[PDB]
């Protein structure tokens, strides 16, 4: 019963295309279609989250004339050192009276900072992105919205017409296999695997989830000897890898990605870039087809062009006059590829004229347009 | 509010400070413990040894702070509290050990107050304070109009949170002024405090006292004394020695002014004047404040470039058939095509 029509539209946005449908035995008709939005969404699997680390140091244990023992703790990047021959002072005088064998036990460890719930970046594995598109379809004056996945195996039915979208001519994505997401920005980065990060670099402190108690850290934290009687816990530690990364992030994919892809997060997606093309197949019902003899007759038709200019816009103006004894609608299509018509169809009643804009690179412009069951020739003299 | 009793059984303390003024270190009542700068709006959360909004009688009073003074806590005016870097900072709020302030760019951070004796006390730490840029434009102040972008801030809230600092029973505090030389004897003055003492003097001269004690036939240089049996609990600062292998935890204090992601306003650079050439776009850029300019091609090779624009800069870019995308500061990106 139905007829399947196939067309291909470049993967662009905001550009209308005319689709010509001509089933044998029936009058040809033009369907107007425009691509309004294209979205590509990667599947993301979180490996870990990187955030600022907090170094936590408890009061140093000072044992007067005696040896302090060090315990092995399971805290992240735990460091412990025992120093001897120390003679610490407080504001009111020396801490110990007996200095023969004074020993100080110093400890430090690394915890997730408070900001790890607010300021953090997620390290994801990206794969098998799903492509989808939003099409505007205009048939018989009716503007409808068609949304489908551009895989070639997915379709939706709107106004009894089935729209099959895809497969895409390209499976290219702006997102690499390994990406890092921070707030509204996405970066392509070869981040280190969990359990094997590096000090001063992104991924120095890692956790699988924001609420996890399982925290990995490598800050190369080393405890140093007290400064000659000063009570404190001096140490050598690598700079936060997250802070380093934040300053060295550079431009995000929103600004660096090719094909003009717009990048957004929550969910992570690439939007409206010129990647390949999108084939479309439409199942058009028999009710949508009419014969040429079923069209209303038009008479007293003519075309004139009062003015034409050369510019990037449609500076030319072509006006087609018509008369009809009966009210009805007629399909319109150009008989040449030199000049296109913005109107897929027109409404005809009484005595009136319709205005179509056009552009050309040639000073002498000639074209013909088929209207309803007849044809009208147009010509113009164009100037700079 | 005054319903926070987490400081009810706690005290302020003295701690080491690398610079108490004139480049000389000392033990200070306002010694800094740490500086937190996770906020993106430039707000700093400063932790100090003194406690703000609390009186020595353990009553709440937002106009007063309490600081340690030779074993005893003492009151001071909160109005005398200051924070500065390269220039004076604006304090947004305080609670206990934590001060929230917005400081100007500088390499150091100083906190101090005027005590009960009208003596100024301060502590200076090195601190590379240089606030991050929110958005793609720089500014010295927030505009009345601009783009809304998210950034981290410290919330003006004293409500309990999950992050806490442990409070432990403090160590015996050495005090050389407890002992005095009386002829050939050493006298220990308690002044109501419990005092632990040890000596090299002959006889059983080790022990505790709650009353005046005299050790015979020796000199002060052969004795040591410290105040013990503390009744109020103290934060387990890294600058204060622990008296026990695993410490002696008595309670915990929540950290006030939690970090949150909030809407932050940034200025927009004035729109450029644009003219066109042959496959070229010409922009006249007249920003009031330093503005980042960046652009990419809409083809296979984006050729991404970026530069900072100061003032009155003329920029000419090549426009490919695929189109050129240009981002000007915090304004929406412009799209150009060949004419």
């Amino acid at each position, epitope marked *: 019963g139905s007829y399947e029509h196939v067309t291909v539209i470049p993967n662009t946005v905001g550009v209308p295309y005319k689709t010509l449908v001509n089933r044998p035995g029936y009058s040809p008709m033009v369907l107007e279609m425009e691509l309004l939005s294209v979205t590509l969404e990667p599947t993301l699997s979180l490996d870990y989250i990187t955030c600022e680390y907090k170094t936590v140091i408890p009061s140093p244990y000072v044992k007067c004339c*005696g040896t302090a023992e060090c315990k092995d703790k399971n805290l992240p990047d735990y460091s412990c050192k025992v120093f001897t021959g120390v003679y610490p002072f407080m504001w009111g005088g020396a801490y110990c009276f007996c200095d023969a064998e004074n020993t100080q036990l110093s400890e430090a460890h690394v915890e997730k900072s408070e900001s790890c719930k607010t300021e953090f970046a997620s390290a994801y594995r990206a794969h098998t992105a799903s492509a989808s598109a939003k099409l505007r379809v205009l048939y018989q004056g009716n503007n409808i919205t068609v949304t489908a996945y551009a895989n070639g195996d997915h379709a939706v039915t709107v106004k009894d017409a089935k729209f099959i979208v895809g497969p895409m001519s390209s499976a290219w994505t702006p997102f690499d296999n390994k990406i890092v997401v921070y707030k509204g920005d996405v970066y392509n980065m070869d981040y280190p695997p969990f359990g094997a990060g590096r000090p001063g670099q992104f991924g120095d402190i890692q956790s699988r989830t924001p609420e996890s108690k399982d925290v990995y850290a490598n800050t190369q934290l080393v405890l140093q000897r007290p400064a000659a009687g000063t009570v404190h816990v001096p140490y050598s530690q690598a700079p936060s890898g997250f802070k380093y990364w934040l300053k060295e992030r550079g431009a995000s994919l929103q600004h660096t990605a090719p094909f003009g892809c717009q990048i957004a997060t929550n969910p992570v997606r690439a939007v409206n870039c010129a990647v390949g093309n999108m084939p479309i197949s439409i199942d058009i019902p028999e009710a949508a087809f009419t014969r040429v003899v079923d069209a209303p007759s038009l008479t007293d038709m003519s075309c004139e062009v009062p003015a034409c200019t050369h510019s990037s816009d449609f500076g030319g103006v072509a006006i087609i006059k018509y008369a009809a004894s009966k009210k009805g609608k007629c399909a319109v299509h150009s008989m040449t590829n030199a000049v296109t018509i913005r109107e897929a169809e027109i409404e005809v009643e009484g005595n009136s004229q319709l205005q179509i804009s056009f552009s050309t690179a040639l000073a002498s412009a000639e074209f013909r347009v088929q209207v309803c069951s007849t044809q009208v020739h147009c010509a113009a003299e164009c100037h700079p | 509010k005054d319903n926070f009793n987490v400081y009810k059984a706690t005290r302020p303390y003295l701690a080491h400070c690398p610079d108490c003024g004139e480049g000389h270190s000392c033990h200070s009542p306002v010694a800094l413990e740490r500086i937190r700068n996770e906020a993106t709006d430039g707000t700093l959360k400063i932790q100090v040894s003194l406690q703000i909004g609390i009186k020595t009688d353990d009553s709440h009073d937002w106009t007063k702070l309490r600081y340690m003074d030779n074993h005893m806590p003492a009151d001071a005016e909160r109005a005398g509290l200051f924070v500065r870097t390269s220039a004076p900072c604006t304090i947004t709020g305080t609670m206990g050990h934590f001060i929230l302030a917005r400081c100007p760019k500088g390499e150091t951070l100083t906190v101090g107050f005027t005590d009960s004796r009208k003596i100024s006390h301060s502590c200076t730490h090195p601190f590379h304070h240089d606030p991050p840029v929110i958005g793609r434009e720089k500014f010295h102040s927030r505009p009345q109009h601009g783009k809304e972008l998210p950034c981290s801030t410290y919330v003006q809230s004293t409500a309990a949170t999950t992050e806490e600092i442990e409070v432990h029973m403090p160590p015996d505090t050495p005090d050389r002024t407890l002992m005095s030389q009386q002829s050939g004897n050493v006298k220990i003055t308690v002044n109501g405090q419990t005092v632990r003492y040890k000596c090299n003097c002959g006889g059983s001269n080790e*022990g505790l006292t709650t009353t005046d004690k005299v050790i015979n036939n020796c000199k002060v240089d052969q004795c040591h004394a410290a105040v013990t049996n503390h009744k109020k609990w103290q934060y387990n600062s890294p600058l204060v020695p622990r008296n026990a*292998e695993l410490g002696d935890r008595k309670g915990k204090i929540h950290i006030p002014f939690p970090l949150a992601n909030v809407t932050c306003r940034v200025p927009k650079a004035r729109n450029p004047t644009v003219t066109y050439g042959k496959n070229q776009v010409i922009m006249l850029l007249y920003p009031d404040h330093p503005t980042l300019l960046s652009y990419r091609n809409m083809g296979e090779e984006p050729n991404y470039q970026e530069e900072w624009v100061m003032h009155k800069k003329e920029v000419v870019l090549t426009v490919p058939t695929e189109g050129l995308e240009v981002t000007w500061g915090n304004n929406e990106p412009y799209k150009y095509w060949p004419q």
Partner: antibody
Framework: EVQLVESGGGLVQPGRSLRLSCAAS????????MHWVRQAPGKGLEWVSGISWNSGSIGYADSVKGRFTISRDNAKNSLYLQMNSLRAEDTALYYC?????????????????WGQGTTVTVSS | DIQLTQSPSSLSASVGDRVTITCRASQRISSYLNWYQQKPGKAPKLLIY???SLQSGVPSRFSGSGSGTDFTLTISSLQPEDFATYYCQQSYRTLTRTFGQGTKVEIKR
């Protein structure tokens, strides 16, 4: 939920051995030093033996030093005392107790958790 | 070799009264003394460690102190539940902890 549970004990003749054990729950076992303390009927508390975390250091009372052996199993969360050549003088109620440190060399701490001691009787 | 000595035997006092128990070493052992409380049929409970520090769950009625080499345990006001045998302990900074002989608090009549 923090508790210690003594087991073993009972009646033996002089010269025979007896093995005591103590189960721990509600706290990390290997984070603390532990001790055995015995109380004879009508008498005060007497420390018998003790062991540090990770069995780094072991001490004994002089009266049992050459006869008793103390050990711990940090996988089973349990403490053991092996008493050999038991004498009539060793009759007592034996308690296990948890210290507040990991080393036995910290003199600031006492034993915060005590179990329910098991009676050991030595008699012909 | 070194023993702790407490009050000779027992202290008789009424409810609401004040009780002080003194413990001393024949030789100096440590800077701190622990205190324990035991009731018949029950395990010893730690009240004070580090000479001055109260254990959690222990009421303010109990207070650690001392004078010279002699440490004390003070009960500011006896409750019906405070009648028990109290022990003192020192560690020598090693595993070989020692206890005093025990001081019993009896009801006054």
């Amino acid at each position: 939920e923090v508790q210690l549970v003594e087991s073993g004990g009972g009646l033996v003749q002089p010269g025979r051995s007896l093995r005591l054990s103590c189960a721990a729950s509600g706290f990390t076992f290997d984070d603390y030093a532990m001790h055995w303390v015995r109380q004879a009927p009508g008498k005060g508390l007497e420390w018998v033996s003790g062991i540090s975390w990770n069995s780094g250091s072991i001490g004994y009372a002089d009266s049992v030093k050459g006869r008793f052996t103390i050990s711990r199993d940090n996988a089973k969360n349990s403490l053991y005392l092996q008493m050999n050549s038991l004498r009539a003088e060793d009759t007592a109620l034996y308690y296990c107790a948890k210290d507040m440190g990991y080393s036995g060399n910290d003199d600031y701490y006492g034993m915060d958790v005590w179990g329910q001691g098991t009676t050991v009787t030595v008699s012909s | 070799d070194i023993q702790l000595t407490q009050s000779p035997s027992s202290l008789s006092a009424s409810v609401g009264d004040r009780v002080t128990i003194t413990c001393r070493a024949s030789q100096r052992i440590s800077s701190y003394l622990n205190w324990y409380q035991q009731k018949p049929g029950k395990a010893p409970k730690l009240l004070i460690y580090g000479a001055f520090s109260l254990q959690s769950g222990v009421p303010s009625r109990f207070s650690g102190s001392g004078s010279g080499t002699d440490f004390t345990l003070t009960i500011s006001s006896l409750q019906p539940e405070d009648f028990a045998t109290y022990y003192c302990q020192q560690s020598y900074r090693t595993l070989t902890r020692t206890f005093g002989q025990g001081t019993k608090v009896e009801i006054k009549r």
